[PDB]
């Protein structure tokens, strides 16, 4: 069958100030034809808590086989306590499993210039939770994308439209073993 991959993300998955069809999850959907459906449920600026609030309706609506969780970066960019982000992500993972879906957790990291003790503590939540729940820990693309000015919006913060096909292709490669086309 054609399973659904739900992406529960922030602007890194929604695409910042662009059409939904331009963002990498839509490009991935198109690449996969109808082998697997990709539903992007991502909103620019969402905290992990905001994503968690949206999740139950999405699980009921979409009944996904897998849920790619790409959240917590906004919490970290706002200097929220790591334990709160950890706990919120923990709840998301519990809810995804309890809906008979497989969570996939994307590592998030803050930029090299961010406060270092804080950034280490923030980034450590992701391998911790992936081990705790025994779920896939997906790699994070943003630092590589930021190396290409031609893939970044004028702020040097958000990937642009031209980045999206590259991200889609890379994500397709990371997700190949999971969807087993
Ligand atoms: C550096 C951590 C990743 C942050 C991405 C979220 C930005 C936004 O949602 O507008």
| Catalytic residue (choose from 11, 42, 48, 123) | 11
State the closest ligand 1 atom to the C-alpha of 10, by its place in the atom list counted from 1: 9
Total domains in the chain come to 1
Find the radius of gyration of the CA atoms of the chain.
15
How many angstroms separate the alpha carbon of residue 10 from the centre of ligand 1?
6
Solving technique: X-ray
Domain that holds residue 166: 1-181
Report how many helices (DSSP H) and strands (DSSP E) the chain contains, helices first.
8, 5
Q: Output phi, psi for 157, to 5 deg.
A: -115, -45
Q: Determine how many CB atoms are found less than 10 A away from the CB of residue 137.
A: 16
Q: Is 11 a catalytic residue?
A: yes
Q: Rounded distance, CA 4 to CA 33, Å?
A: 12
Question: Residue 82 belongs to a domain with what CATH number?
Answer: 3.40.50.1110
Annotated binding-site residue? 100:
no
Angle at which helix 82-98 crosses helix 116-133, to 10 degrees, equals 20
């Amino acid at each position: 069958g054609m399973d659904t991959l739900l992406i529960l993300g922030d602007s890194l998955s929604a695409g910042y100030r662009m059409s939904a069809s331009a963002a990498w999850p839509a490009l991935l959907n198109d690449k996969w034809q109808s082998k697997t459906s990709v539903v992007n449920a991502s909103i620019s600026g969402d905290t992990s808590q905001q994503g968690l609030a949206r999740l139950p309706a999405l699980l009921k609506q979409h009944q996904p086989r897998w849920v790619l969780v790409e959240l917590g970066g906004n919490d970290g960019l706002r200097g929220f306590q790591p334990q709160q982000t950890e706990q919120t992500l923990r709840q998301i993972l519990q809810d995804v499993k309890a809906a008979n879906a497989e969570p996939l957790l994307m590592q998030i990291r803050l930029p090299a210039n961010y406060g270092r003790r804080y950034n280490e503590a923030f980034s450590a939540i992701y391998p911790k939770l992936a081990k705790e729940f025994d779920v896939p820990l997906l790699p994070f693309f943003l630092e590589e994308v930021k190396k290409k000015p031609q893939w970044m919006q004028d702020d040097g913060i958000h990937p642009n439209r031209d980045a999206q096909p590259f991200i889609a292709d890379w994500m397709a490669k990371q997700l190949q073993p999971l969807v087993n086309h």
